[PDB]
Symmetry: C4
Subunit: 407 residues, 4 copies
């Protein structure tokens, strides 16, 4: 059997971040850190499942608290966003549980499909799969950490400045008062306690990490698939000015078909996650874009709002772009194959060219759409239209202006 | 001739529900319950035609009553919905009459096309055609029955509670007063009578059943076609790792072409019904989605409204999905055919792959559109845009709020 | 040379209505009524060109009168429509002049391309080209005549009823007063005279006839092309269950390619007319649909408005449908060709199937779009969206209501 | 080596206007005027780079001045346009710098790809590449010069007429007062000086020239590519009625594949410029179309506004059309290739036809869209929808009307 310890495989590249997500109980798989992907199993009676259950219970407590708070103060389009966030987090938990159910088989087939690409005539690119996945994951994690830090900083600064510059009722600033004020939706349903406060903060951070990790996981999977597609494209490029025997084309076509089968399997496994991520990101992007013209009090509030908006837009765009890189790389080999000489031309090249040309090699949201650059441009246009229609809805709220600091 | 009594055929699977619809006079065909589909005939001078005429007369009476009531009280976008409902029911009646005119030939060709799939190398799946059609029909019928029961319960509860908690003019609750109040649009044109009341209730139930049965019939037809397409896909799958003779591919291609011809014939027969169902469902989905933010008095009213909205959305989505299952199953065999070895590759496989790849195997609304997952996603986007644009229209009505119970 | 007197050719079918349009000076061609299409020539120094110049001068006088009237009374979206109408008529005149410039060559190639289809193995359908063109032209002409008669009847009835039921300033009804009132935009710039009145009425009728004849001409051309495409489809159908020699497929492919070349030539010649008709019909359909909810005084006004709206919608839809019949008929032969046996299969059938499948055989508006059923459905959706967005614009005008009859 | 002095090459056709743009420091390339394209190099330490840096510094000064002026007077959708203009100019500068970085290799490959087309069997069309590029560049430059002259004339006339017909505070007209009034956004941040005034005027002219030159450069590149594609189409046309040897088809296919490779390279180099031009033109077209109904004081203001709007719309449309001419010319050869006789038919013709039919030969905005006539029609529809949605936004501003001349 192949030596998984040092081989450039998708599992070896992705399992560190899979375990990091397991720490906040996203994808409860047993033995995810094992070098051999065959040892990855899904078990309900396991520590990851227990941590996942605890996290869903906490997120459901938060969701119920938000729901009751909104019901007491009424539900408006602006407040609903928080409830939507919590609901999406819960949905992501469930989706990831199902994905873990499907993940052993997926990773097994992935390994048995990517072994041929670990040996010649395929070559490791300048940036290996592990490095690409590491860069993407570090970028997303650091950006999310900065977003959460800016959120906390802006909230704390607004609270302290409101209390200090009020020239009215003081309520001397404190951690307990901050928790009871900014997170009143929680303690209105549960009795306050500092331990509960720390738990609420940690679970909110976990919810944010889950929200970002859906997109990050999609990015890593797309990177893994486009890695092998780019390897195929490079191997084809190596035959640009050579007379190619039919066996070479047979092997190339077989490997391409195997990669397409793996892509179909992964798409079937990940369709629910792709759908949830796309719809949630679209909704949140529209909601935040509707608030660009809104007036905020402190410069830190503007900084946080614009950082969050730009990071959300970039994360959605890069999810779509990494997914569409599969399609672009699949199509890139067509240009090289079209240069095949008449002497090297045969039935296998015709089959491969027809498949590349007519088959849409791309991830899909339950086949309700395919993640391509066409889809990203269409999404941008749809967002523009929705924002144009909705800014008229938001005009009355926009003209309300900033509320008095004392009030 | 083949023994139709125990053979797994579409007619044997669908005729029970065709007869059930005939009971409310939807599709007036003679001998629909006969095991031999060749005995199914359409005759104007027949009992089903007479019951159909009676039902269209009753529905036209209801339509005229609604029209006169709206004219007396003025036509608004909110009231127009009822008139639209009645008109759609009448249109469905006419469409189904034409479909019955076309149905003998259709079923005949269907039978003569599906006989090859009843014998090897084709195998009956885990869920046979009869079971799939039964599950779909039972689900739709039960959901529609629950919707109508919730409608009646909510209306009766609202009427009784309005009369009781009025602290004003009483008009002691009774069946006659309920009929004269909730269905005042009828008795304003015809003299009241309890027999007329029972007739009105029965005809309203029949109209609801027709509205649901258009979608149900589309679902059953799509199930029947996708059944044979899935049989073809499974037979192809059985040759994944075998050297296939040219005769096998010839037979597969011939059966696929015959199934495509049957699909074209059925689409030509059912294009009007598909168009009517799609347009009616789109209009009603938009209308009901426009009322999600409206305020209702009793929790039973909310329960009925949300049950009806969710059932309508799910029924439209599942009609589109069952229709698109034909396209998905037709495309599913392409992945297996692409794995055909170079030794088994021949002209027949090339022809079949080209046809699968370039031919859009899907039901269509008079070719004005094709029922695919692409079409369902586009429909969802169009509904979102229409609702965004229309909620501004509905804002003045939304802010009116609940009327006084006494008034 | 072939005997054009009794041959079933497009020129013989269309020249009567071409001459009828020439009577109002639409397409100024010399010798359009000659049996031999080679005798059709375009000459600036000809009687048709003189009548065309006279008609453009009259239409320009009307356009200037409308422009000055609107400038004196201000330009609003509701009045602009008349100016747009006149401008479109002038544009149609110019376009048709250019089309006549291109029409000799077009008709020549058409004849030299349709001669093969006048002899076996091609057969004349049940409805020959002349009968189809006659039916379409008679339908359009009669509907336009009824529309204009209803317009005049409604205007005269409104004028007479306003004068009679005023109980105020009388201005006893007369032809001169009616002309000065309803067509005040003309006589405000030119001195009144009964001869001028008759000229204005005749030129308005001519403008309406031109507006309808653009669509009618598109319909006749689409009928002519789809006639030969249907002949090809029928010839292919005749080989469903026969072993076909390669020469038959060679001839079929050659004739199909020649028909495609003729379609490309006709599309190049008629692209400007198609674009103008599409844009004008879209604008007018949107404008009239915006007025469905407007309140009119007399039932005759409602009758005229709804007749005009329904006729406009049906004319646009049937233009698109007749144009798309070319594409549908081109695609219809694919189903038959796919049934070709393995023994009769050859390179020619593969070429023909690939061309049918991948070539979009359809008329186009300068290739800015292709007239297909897809395009008609998209146009309907776009009109729905535009009307939804514009009814909010029209709400203030809609709520104004009917003006006082006396005022 | 080939004699570049008199050869009909893209570099010889385009370098005069490249140098003209270099005069305002758009594309800083060294030796752009050399006959040999191999001598074109990009160097940071060069005079063009220094002039480019000076121009970006001046444009950044203008951008900061506009930003500070808007911040002092508040930012509104109407004023933001100027800031957007300046930002777009800066972005264009950066993009063109990167394009120059990529331009040596691009032009080298272009030359080595277009040498075969300078010799038989390829023929120079009636209008050579140099003449086409000259016509396009002269048209764009003259239209932009007229637009700027009309802008200056309208501004000066409005200023002088406001001062003269005020019957109030005079501020006798002068160049200094005009500069301080119309360009108050600049001198509010920098001290006034006539030299600074001349510099501001020159830099504004340079910004306008850059804005137009992005589109002009796209047009010239599209002309260059469509030139060779049209040469290929003409060569194919020359074989319409001849028996063609396989070697001729091999050469045609090889040249077509080389042209497609060159198009892909140029698209990769120019994707950023295409994206920027498309988005900027869309935004400005929408903004100016939103102001068609606005009321202007003097007829010269209307003349300038409508000249600018029509020129902008035509420039965008012609950019899209020149880019799509590549696709249209690539597709034009398919009709001729489909007429190839059965005896001349071979594998090479099949390959070429499949490539032409299934490959989208067109420029693209980073593959986020392809510049086709389909894309132009979609852009027109999107602009119509956006304007319909936005005119409701602009209604309050439209009804404000012209401000008092004195105020």
């Amino acid at each position: 059997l192949p030596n998984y310890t040092n081989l450039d495989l998708f599992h070896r590249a992705v399992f560190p971040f899979m375990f990091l997500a397991q720490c906040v109980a996203i994808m409860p798989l047993v033995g995810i850190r094992e070098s051999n992907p065959r040892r990855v199993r899904f078990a309900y009676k396991s520590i990851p499942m227990f941590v996942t259950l605890i996290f869903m219970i906490a997120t459901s407590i938060l969701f119920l608290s938000m729901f009751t708070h909104l019901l007491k103060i009424g539900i408006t389009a602006k407040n609903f966003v928080g409830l939507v966030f919590f609901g999406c987090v819960l949905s992501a938990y469930v989706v990831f549980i199902r994905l873990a159910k499907k993940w052993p088989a997926v990773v097994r087939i992935w390994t048995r499909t990517e072994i041929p690409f670990t040996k010649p005539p395929y070559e490791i690119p300048k940036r290996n799969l592990s490095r690409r996945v590491q860069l993407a994951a570090l970028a997303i994690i650091g950006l999310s950490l900065g977003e959460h830090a800016l959120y906390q900083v802006s909230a704390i600064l607004s609270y302290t400045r409101r209390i200090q510059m009020c020239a009215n009722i003081t309520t001397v600033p404190s951690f307990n008062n901050y928790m009871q004020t900014n997170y009143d939706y929680v303690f209105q349903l549960l009795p306050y306690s500092p331990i509960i406060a720390v738990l609420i903060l940690l679970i909110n951070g976990a919810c944010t990490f889950v929200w970002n990790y859906m997109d990050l996981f999609i990015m890593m999977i797309s990177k893994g698939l486009s890695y092998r597609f780019e390897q195929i494209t490079t191997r084809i490029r190596k035959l640009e000015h050579e007379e190619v025997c039919e066996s070479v084309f047979i092997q190339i076509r077989e490997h391409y078909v195997k990669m397409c089968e793996l892509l179909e399997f992964v798409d079937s496994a990940m369709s629910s996650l792709i759908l949830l991520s796309c719809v949630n990101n679209l909704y949140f992007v529209c909601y935040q874009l509707l608030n660009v013209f809104n007036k905020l009090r402190w410069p830190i509030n503007y900084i946080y709002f614009w950082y969050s908006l730009l990071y959300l837009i970039g994360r959605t765009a890069f999810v779509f772009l990494t997914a569409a890189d599969i399609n672009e790389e699949s199509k890139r080999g067509l240009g090289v194959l079209r240069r095949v000489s008449s002497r090297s031309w045969c039935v296998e090249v015709e089959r491969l060219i027809f498949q590349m040309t007519t088959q849409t090699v791309a991830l899909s949201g339950k086949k309700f759409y395919f993640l391509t650059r066409r889809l990203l441009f269409g999404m941008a246009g749809t967002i523009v239209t929705y924002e144009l229609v909705l800014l008229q809805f938001d005009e009355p709220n926009r003209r309300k202006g900033l509320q008095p600091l004392c009030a």
